[PDB]
Design a protein around this ligand. Structure first.
Ligand SMILES: [Zn+2]
Ligand SMILES: [Zn+2]
Ligand SMILES: [Zn+2]
Lengths: 872, 734, 280
RNA sequence: UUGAUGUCACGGAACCUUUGUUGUCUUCGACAUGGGUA
């Protein structure tokens, strides 16, 4: 595969000829004092030609072309070669270097075609992308015969300056083994010490260290504060190997350290997959649909006059990420992460032209409300969208921010059990919000300024409705166009056109600085404005309880040694990352989707019991499926104010000994929330207007959101101990079309007086504890009640209880063991200066009585304990 | 319970035995698979009894340790599911589970046979979503080939692997792809294997015969029992076998029997096989494809559905157009050639995806009768994609309007464009001219013309017209002169008698041509100077009725660009601006004259969703067709710019699109006046005023066109001709 | 050995499924059907000991506890003979030995507690402090809800034990149900307070079905939940290692083992609620 | 490293679908020790 890239002079000649036709239209076919033919573009032996023109030739005169046997040819026929006269050479990198293969200069990327109606791709194609920052310049020679007239050369030189794109990119044409070895040490340590259940967790946590090597020095210790962590001190230890790797001078560079953690995590990831010995599923399968366009070779040749009026409108601005975004690009080598983002070779984030055009084309069809059914090949489609898109140019954009992507872990819940489904865990790289991309759109055409469709589209983007990336259903890819400035250039005027040619259209960075001074602030106002497809709903959630959005990988890495930590995300501020706590969009979407699915049925079957593959139930119509994109988009919910996580610790009590059982530590670090200082969770989800105009769709969402508002769908984890309990949910921005559905006092009987009789004598001394002997029969059922629906004949609701102390109560605050000044001292448990009893304390207390009354099992019991007495 | 199954396997399991170890592995494999799916079996929370013994047996099994046999039985469960949705889902699970084993070097052939067969069956179930063949279907058939080639490299004559390789190769041909490289070699080996008495395999041996001319397999084919479910396939196979044996009488007998029992759905592979039979008989110069093609067309033409009066819907079969071209070329009677051509006209052809869109529209408007009929079509086509492979066969007519009903003084000119004949270098365009006043042996004439240059002239005007309307006037005059050069018989008195009115029934892109404005060369003669023209979308819409005796005129205007002076101020009611409610009310009162001046929007993909741009709302074509209590018998309707706005740009020369004029003819409207291209507002005011005043559209339009022709004659300017040419009359009143 | 295989979990699960508590409260493989919320104090705190600063009544005065040592299963399982089994579930009885702690004296000996790196100092609420919490339930049978309410409210004269130092008399709490609200559907929620007696009846009938009249674990549980009445101050404490170590003159652990609490008869003593170990 | 009178490839959004969830009261009393004597 060794060699080098090059550009054919035939491809350059093709673009020059296309530019000459546009210039001859503006000059009405005149170059200086000579007039030009339409040219000849018809050959009888059409088989010899690799490609035939499918577009229509531009028309500037009605006269017949030059004769085949003519003494003189017009300047446009001289350019075509109907007179080598003008020979084009290949364009090569200067110096003729060599590279190992195509992957030494660039990377293949899949470019898909998305079906407009379904929102899903059904075919794709691939191409190598070679970064301009590494290989910017190709050099070549155009050979011109001396018998070529001056008017022809003037047309040629003006056409080179007019030619603005080639090979898919805007252009200016001028004429004049540590990870390998560390993986084995870690794997051997894991295998020697019989700790292989942690191979995947260690791989994910080590990969998260690529952010900075200073994370190694802060790796958590055990609850005692000593280097005895269950993961980093398994062995030397894993921590010492990581600490040695961090201190290595080779890994001192942040770029070298980042590659090391990625290679190490990938090596440990392969080993973890090899361990399992059951059924193995390929998740990404049946995905190859590589279809290439096929040009039509029996296409009718046409000559079309477009008129002498040509105006180019330049729009420069900024595309600012208001949410995390995901431009999907999966590397074949990397398998640890299921979903990856598109980055530049120097690890900068990228906003590609292919995605920008795809969003423009989709939005133009949305404005016209007219799908395009054109196929790849043939003459260009003549609908309003395709004709506008042929006048549109967008420049590929990259950021300054270059920090590693944050990886979000998504699961699928088994709806019958209420737990994670077997093997349903996958990763996704996520680009951060707050990134700024330099935006430049140019439109070329005969209208006065922009078309009304493009004025409305660019106004949509300026209002923050530029949804430009994948993963839209989980709130990825919303941009706003900011600092928009425009100026229309009149290419029909000869003075303006000569000035436009002289500066190569002001498209290079130097020329663009001059042009940005000429631009006027704002956007052209659309004469006929149409409302955007998506409408924003603002959601307010009040939480009088602690909240946690489980992030297991951050728990393993955070300097806090806690077992469970809350999800946090990073915002880009220039080239810095600012962490904030958030409720994940994926988690919130899953809860909302479950609330709809558990109360709706299709043909008597709950929607949770459906496979929802090749399905068109109510749930698939609103939330999408594997065949049709969803019509509702959930964003991350952030917290008003800045609550700081607090730590809670728990112990399981052996039902026989009555003391703390020997179990793995499961302390949690949730965000505090209380009735006095409730958590305020705010964000927005967007819903398509056709969904918002449908009475049955708004009815389905209103019923589900009524159950969330009534505290039936807690947010986050640890719901059993009192976390994530929603006090109220409100929505605004729907004209009450959904919120309209989101809206006796009998005394509780007194307890019976007990019949338990205990006789106590003052002279006796009694033991502090006694044992209740269980019945020998334990009633067990093989299948418990499923969670997939509200079953008929069952009961769902709330119990409100009052607890009163009869003797002094000690529920300690164990965060501070030296409260009253070794001799440990504790204060009573409180949250936000409010005296409380956590639900886990009350849960375990009542569970023990329930086990004894129902004669259940010993739920907490140290079975593997081995007793030992002493000989007498 | 999967757990109870494992426990039973553990009670009686001999590890040296292979029957027990296969059952135990099956119970283990089944339990793991039900866990990955979040099925209701995951609610089983119990464990295995006799833990010390269960642990030892399970530990020995893991040290002793087929994947192929368990998954083979899972595939045999797929072939028995009735619905294609059930089969498509289960094929999804089999493919993803067996992908791991295929990567392994030591991969069992049973594992590879099951996975290749699952890819082939999933490839048959890919539903199209466009004009192109699904790219996934091609990939699925290529993956099945790759897996079989792994087996075939080890054993070049594996019986089942060859069949799966040949099944996928045939479907690649059906998808427009060429045959793979070794198709000739793989086909020879299956012949060496022997003969298989299965319909899905007989076609493979016929392909062998056509390439090797070996007669040993032909007599075996002719002896097959005729008690099978897919009898039409066997009759076609025997007709193919009889043709190689020169038993031409039996080719006719079996070929006719196959067509008489043909499957209802066009997705059935029989239809492409039937067309290939005709193309081969025609290629071998056998004068027997003509009977087959005519009979095939005669049954193919009843595969349509009715969407209200005069509006017919059909589903897309890619080779239906070729079959009609074959039947047209086979038929010799000119009158019967007109019946073939007229069977295509005024019919909307929708893909399976667009039929879902129309199914949803019918559901919204509570049109359950039309929704149920669309459901059967959708299911029947989707359920026939793997019917040949599964060996299943799941279980209307319209009258002909006689040609003598045309009044004696008139002349009818039917058109048909033959794409197949034009590709072969012939004159694909045919004018079928009918003269009621001639002798019955001379009443019909068939004029053949080449439409290649005419179609190119139309596309140049259409592109110049879309980019710069009214600046395309010169290209229009060049186009109108191209009509006469293509069809010079229109200006010959022998072909068309002078002074007699001419009825036009165009086909394809000829519906969008100004046939009445054909120009013959320094003086210039326009067609309307000699004849008065009418237009019909098809001959089967010919239902003359007396005009409406009620005298009342309406002007539904939603056109703010221009104010029509001569039309708005007068005896005509002006309900401007116009909303869908206003339009519906005016339709129900049966006006003598109705004017609808507005804009419209075109839907390229689905003509039933093209809409009239009205005040605060849009009215789709399907909205117009579904209005209840509509009386428009003998009502003369004049349309503004909406008619040209709601027709997409042309893409194929034989494509026809439904517009407002078809929507109004469905309501038995007498006459409809509309322009082919966008009509100048001032000329619309002048032209429509004269028609309403004099109430004789056929005569008045010819007079008005000639009165404006005199102005054009003095200057010969294309700009004036651009404004008078577009107007034409649609419909044939009594 | 079966680490990579999914059937390893089946060797860790009972052949007959899940007990009533593993359905209502769940397992690592099955989600529970109940949710317990944080309790919040309803009034101003009442503290066991006044705080150092009388200005703020929201902090209390420290109290030093005695030594809280690990439970000893070798006491309840005297020897390695297979006749010695796990006696049952441990419940701490209710008593007022916290009054001796408040005075600063040891419960067993009556001698002043001395500060040590082993014992702890706590801020304890007094008796008479009320809390509010809610329990959320989903898909419960009428017998599951009836026993859950029974497990919560218990009966008049019974109480729970919550928090630290349950051996010393700390943690007697009584729960009272005050509202049951049921989800009829997405739009309607009703009041279920009137249907509580029927839920209680079906819970008891479910126990009569499983065990017939053999309900002795229930009666022994209610004796261990029994709360001392008026003018009843049971003396409840652990004996010392030796009789000489006890200033009260009561027996020690050395003297009890060669006595009433011998290995042959110790477990019967421990599983009989309110069994004295000394008479004074 | 192109071929020339014909390249809309800025003619194609890696797009679509999956809740880090589940289960556990910061709880608590009996020893420790190996011989020694004959
Ligand atoms: Zn020339
Ligand atoms: Zn288009
Ligand atoms: Zn569904």
């Amino acid at each position: 595969t060794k060699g080098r890239p090059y550009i054919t002079g035939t491809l350059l000649r093709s673009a020059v000829i296309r530019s000459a036709e546009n210039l001859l239209t503006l000059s009405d076919g005149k170059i200086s004092e000579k007039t030009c033919c339409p040219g000849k573009f018809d050959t009888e032996d059409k088989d010899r030609l690799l490609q035939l023109r499918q577009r229509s030739t531009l028309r500037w005169t009605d006269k017949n072309p030059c004769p085949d046997n003519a003494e003189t040819y017009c300047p446009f026929c001289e350019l075509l070669g109907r007179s080598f006269r003008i020979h084009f050479g290949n364009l090569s990198l200067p110096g003729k270097p060599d590279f190992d293969g195509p992957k030494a200069i660039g990377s293949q990327r899949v470019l898909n075609r998305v079906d407009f109606k379904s929102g899903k791709a059904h075919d794709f194609f691939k191409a190598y992308e070679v970064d301009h920052t590494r290989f910017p310049r190709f050099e070549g020679e155009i050979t011109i015969d001396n018998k070529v007239s001056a008017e022809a050369r003037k047309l040629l030189c003006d056409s080179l300056k007019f030619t603005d794109r080639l090979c898919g990119a805007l252009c200016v044409i001028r004429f004049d083994n540590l990870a390998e070895k560390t993986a084995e040490q870690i794997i051997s340590i894991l295998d020697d010490n019989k700790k292989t259940e942690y191979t995947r967790l260690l791989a994910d946590a080590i990969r998260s260290l690529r952010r900075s090597s200073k994370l190694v020095a802060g790796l958590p210790k055990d609850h005692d504060g000593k280097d005895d962590h269950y993961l980093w001190d398994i062995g030397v230890t894993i921590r010492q190997i990581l600490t040695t790797s961090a201190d290595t001078k080779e890994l001192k560079n942040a770029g070298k350290w980042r590659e090391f953690c990625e290679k190490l995590g990938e090596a440990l990831y392969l080993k973890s997959k090899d361990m399992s010995g059951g059924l193995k599923i390929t998740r990404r399968i049946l995905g190859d649909a590589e279809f290439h366009g096929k040009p039509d070779r029996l296409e009718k040749s046409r000559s079309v006059s477009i008129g002498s009026v040509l105006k180019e409108t330049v729009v420069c601005g900024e595309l600012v990420a208001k949410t995390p975004f995901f431009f999907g690009a999966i590397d074949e080598d990397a398998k640890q992460t299921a979903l990856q983002v598109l980055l530049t070779p120097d690890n900068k984030y990228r906003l590609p032209r292919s995605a920008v055009r795809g969003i423009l084309r989709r939005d133009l069809q949305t404005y016209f409300d007219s799908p395009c059914n054109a196929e790849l090949g043939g003459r260009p489609c003549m609908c309003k969208t395709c004709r506008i898109m042929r006048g549109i140019t967008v420049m590929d954009a990259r950021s300054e921010y270059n920090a590693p992507p944050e990886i979000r872990h998504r699961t699928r819940i088994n709806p019958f059990t209420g737990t994670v489904a077997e093997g349903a865990l996958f990763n996704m790289e996520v680009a951060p919000e707050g990134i700024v991309f330099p935006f430049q759109l140019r439109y070329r055409g005969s209208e006065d300024g922009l078309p009304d469709a493009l004025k409305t589209v660019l106004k949509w983007w300026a209002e923050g409705q530029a949804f430009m990336s994948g993963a839209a259903s989980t709130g990825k890819g919303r941009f706003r166009m900011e600092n928009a400035k425009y100026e229309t250039l009149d290419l029909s005027d000869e003075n303006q056109r000569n000035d436009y040619l002289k500066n190569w259209g002001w498209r290079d960075e130097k020329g663009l600085e001059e042009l940005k001074k000429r631009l006027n602030s704002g956007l052209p106002e659309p004469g006929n404005y149409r409302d955007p497809k998506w409408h924003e709903i603002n959601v307010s959630i009040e939480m009088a309880s602690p909240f946690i959005n489980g992030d297991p990988i951050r728990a393993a890495v955070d300097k806090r040694g806690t077992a469970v930590v809350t999800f946090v995300k990073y915002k880009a501020e220039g080239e810095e990352a600012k962490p904030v706590c958030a409720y994940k969009a994926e988690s919130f979407r899953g809860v909302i989707r479950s609330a709809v699915a558990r109360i709706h049925m299709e043909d008597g079957v709950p929607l949770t019991e459906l496979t929802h593959s090749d399905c068109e139930c109510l749930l698939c119509q609103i939330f999408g499926s594997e065949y049709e994109a969803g019509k509702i988009r959930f964003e991350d919910l952030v917290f008003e104010s800045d609550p700081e996580p607090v730590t809670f610790d728990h112990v399981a009590i052996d039902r026989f000994t009555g003391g703390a059982a020997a179990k793995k530590k499961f302390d949690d670090s949730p965000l505090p929330g209380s009735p006095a200082r409730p958590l305020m969770l705010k964000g927005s989800f967007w819903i398509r207007r056709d969904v918002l105009e449908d009475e049955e769709y708004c009815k389905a969402l209103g019923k589900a959101l009524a159950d969330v508002n009534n505290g039936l769908y807690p947010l986050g984890g640890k719901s059993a101990i009192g976390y994530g309990q929603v006090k109220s949910l409100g929505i605004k921005g729907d004209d009450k079309r959904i919120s309209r559905l989101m809206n006796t006092d009998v005394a509780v009987p007194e307890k019976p007086k007990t019949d338990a009789e205990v006789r106590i004598e003052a002279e006796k001394v009694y033991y502090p504890h006694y044992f209740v002997e269980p019945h020998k029969k334990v009633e067990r059922e093989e299948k418990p009640c499923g969670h997939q629906k509200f079953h008929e004949g069952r009961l769902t609701g709330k119990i409100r209880c009052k607890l009163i102390t009869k003797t002094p109560l000690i529920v300690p605050d164990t965060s501070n063991d030296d409260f009253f000044r070794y001799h440990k001292s504790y204060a009573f448990f409180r949250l936000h200066k409010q005296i409380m009893i956590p639900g886990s304390e009350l849960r375990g207390m009542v569970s023990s009585v329930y086990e004894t009354v129902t004669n259940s099992c010993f739920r907490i019991f140290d079975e593997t304990k081995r007793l030992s007495w002493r000989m007498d | 319970n999967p757990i109870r199954d494992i426990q039973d396997r553990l009670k009686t399991a001999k590890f040296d035995n292979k029957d027990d170890m296969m059952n135990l592995a099956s119970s283990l494999y089944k339990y793991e698979k039900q866990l990955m799916d979040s099925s209701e079996a995951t609610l089983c929370q119990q464990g295995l009894s006799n833990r010390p013994n269960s642990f030892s047996q399970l530990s020995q099994f893991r040290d002793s340790d087929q994947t192929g046999k368990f998954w083979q039985n899972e595939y045999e469960a797929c072939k028995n599911f009735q619905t294609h949705k059930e089969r498509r889902e289960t094929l999804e699970q089999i493919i993803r589970f067996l992908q791991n084993g295929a990567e392994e070097k030591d991969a069992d052939d049973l594992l590879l046979k099951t996975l290749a067969r699952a890819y082939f069956h999933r490839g048959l179930l890919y539903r199209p979503k466009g004009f192109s063949v699904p790219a996934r279907k091609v990939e699925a058939m290529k993956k099945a080939i790759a897996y079989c080639e792994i087996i075939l490299d080890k054993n070049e004559e594996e019986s089942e692997a060859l069949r799966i390789w040949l099944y996928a190769a045939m479907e690649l041909r059906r998808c427009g792809e060429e045959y793979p490289e070794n198709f000739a070699e793989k086909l020879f080996y299956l012949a060496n294997d022997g003969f298989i008495s299965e319909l899905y395999d007989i076609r493979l041996f016929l392909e062998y015969t056509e390439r090797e001319e070996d007669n040993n397999f032909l007599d075996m084919i002719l002896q097959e029992n005729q008690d099978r479910e897919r009898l039409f396939e066997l009759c076609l196979y025997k007709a193919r076998a009889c043709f190689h044996l020169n038993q031409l009488n039996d080719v006719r007998i079996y070929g006719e029997s196959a067509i008489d029992n043909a499957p209802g759905a066009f997705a059935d592979p029989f239809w492409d096989e039937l067309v290939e039979f005709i193309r081969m008989l025609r290629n071998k110069k056998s004068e027997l494809w003509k009977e087959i093609a005519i009979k095939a067309w005669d049954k193919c033409r009843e595969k349509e559905m009715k969407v209200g009066n005069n509006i017919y819907l059909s589903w897309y079969w890619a080779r239906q157009r070729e079959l009609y071209d074959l039947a047209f070329m086979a038929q010799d009677g000119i009158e019967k050639k007109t019946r073939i051509a007229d069977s295509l006209k005024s019919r909307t052809t929708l893909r399976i995806q667009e039929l879902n869109e129309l199914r949803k529209d019918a559901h919204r408007k509570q049109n359950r009768r039309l929704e149920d009929k669309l459901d059967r079509i959708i299911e029947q086509e989707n359920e026939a994609r793997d019917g040949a492979y599964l060996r299943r066969n799941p279980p209307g007519k319209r009258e002909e309007i006689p040609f003598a009903r045309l009044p004696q003084n008139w002349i009818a000119v039917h058109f048909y464009l033959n794409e197949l004949e034009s590709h072969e270098g012939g004159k694909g365009g045919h004018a079928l001219i009918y003269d009621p006043q001639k002798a019955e042996k001379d009443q019909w004439q068939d004029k053949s013309f080449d439409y290649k240059e005419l179609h190119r002239k139309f596309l140049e005007w259409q592109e110049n017209y879309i980019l710069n309307e009214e600046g395309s006037a010169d290209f229009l005059v060049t186009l109108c002169r191209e009509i006469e050069k293509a069809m010079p018989f229109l200006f010959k008195s022998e072909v068309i008698p002078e002074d007699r009115p001419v009825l036009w029934i165009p086909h394809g892109f000829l519906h969008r041509l100004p046939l009445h404005a054909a120009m013959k060369s320094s003086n210039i003669e326009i067609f309307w100077e000699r004849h008065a023209s009418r237009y019909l979308p098809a001959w089967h819409l010919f239902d003359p009725a007396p005009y409406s005796r009620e005298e009342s005129s309406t002007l539904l205007k939603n056109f703010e660009e221009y104010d029509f002076q001569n039309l708005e101020n007068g005896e005509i009611e002006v309900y401007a601006p116009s909303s869908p409610k206003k339009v519906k009310e005016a339709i129900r009162e049966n006006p003598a004259i109705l004017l609808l001046l507005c804009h419209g929007e075109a839907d390229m993909t689905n003509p039933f969703r093209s809409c009239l741009k009205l005040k605060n709302k849009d009215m789709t074509i399907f909205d117009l067709l579904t209005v209840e209590d509509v009386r428009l018998s003998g009502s003369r309707i004049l349309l503004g710019a909406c008619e040209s706005d709601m027709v997409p740009p042309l893409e194929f020369s034989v494509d026809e699109h439904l517009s407002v004029s078809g929507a109004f003819l469905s309501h038995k409207a007498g006459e409809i006046v509309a322009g082919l291209w966008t009509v100048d507002s001032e000329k619309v005011d002048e032209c429509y005023s004269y028609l309403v005043e004099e109430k004789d559209f056929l005569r008045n339009l010819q007079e008005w066109q000639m009165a404006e022709t005199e102005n054009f004659r003095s200057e010969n300017d294309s700009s004036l001709f651009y404004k008078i040419a577009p107007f034409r009359i649609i419909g044939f009143p009594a | 050995a079966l680490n990579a295989y999914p059937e390893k979990r089946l060797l860790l699960r009972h052949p007959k499924g899940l007990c009533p508590a593993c359905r209502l409260f769940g397992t690592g493989s099955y989600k529970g059907r109940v949710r317990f919320g944080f309790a919040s104090l309803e009034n101003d705190p009442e503290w066991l000991i006044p705080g150092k600063n009388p200005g703020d009544p929201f902090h209390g005065g420290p109290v030093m506890l005695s030594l809280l040592e690990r439970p000893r299963p070798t006491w309840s399982i005297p020897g390695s003979d297979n006749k010695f089994k796990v006696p049952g579930r441990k419940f701490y009885v209710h008593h007022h030995a916290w009054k001796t702690i408040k005075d600063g004296n040891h419960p067993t000996t009556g001698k002043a507690i001395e500060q040590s790196p082993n014992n702890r100092t706590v801020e304890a609420l007094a008796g008479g402090n009320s809390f509010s919490f809610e329990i959320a339930f989903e898909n419960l049978k009428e017998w599951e809800l009836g026993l859950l309410i029974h497990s919560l409210q218990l009966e008049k004269g019974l109480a729970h034990k919550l928090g630290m130092a349950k051996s010393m008399g700390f943690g007697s709490v009584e729960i009272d149900v005050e509202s049951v609200r049921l989800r009829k559907d997405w739009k309607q929620w009703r009041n279920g307070n009137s249907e509580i007696p029927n839920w209680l009846g079906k819970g008891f009938a479910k126990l009569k079905e499983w065990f017939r009249d053999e309900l002795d674990f229930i009666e022994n549980l209610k004796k261990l939940l029994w709360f001392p009445e008026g003018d009843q101050a049971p003396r409840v404490c652990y004996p010392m290692l030796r009789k000489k170590d006890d200033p009260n003159g009561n027996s020690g652990y050395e003297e009890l083992k060669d006595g009433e609490f011998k290995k042959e008869d110790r477990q019967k003593k421990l599983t009989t609620p309110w069994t004295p170990w000394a008479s004074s």
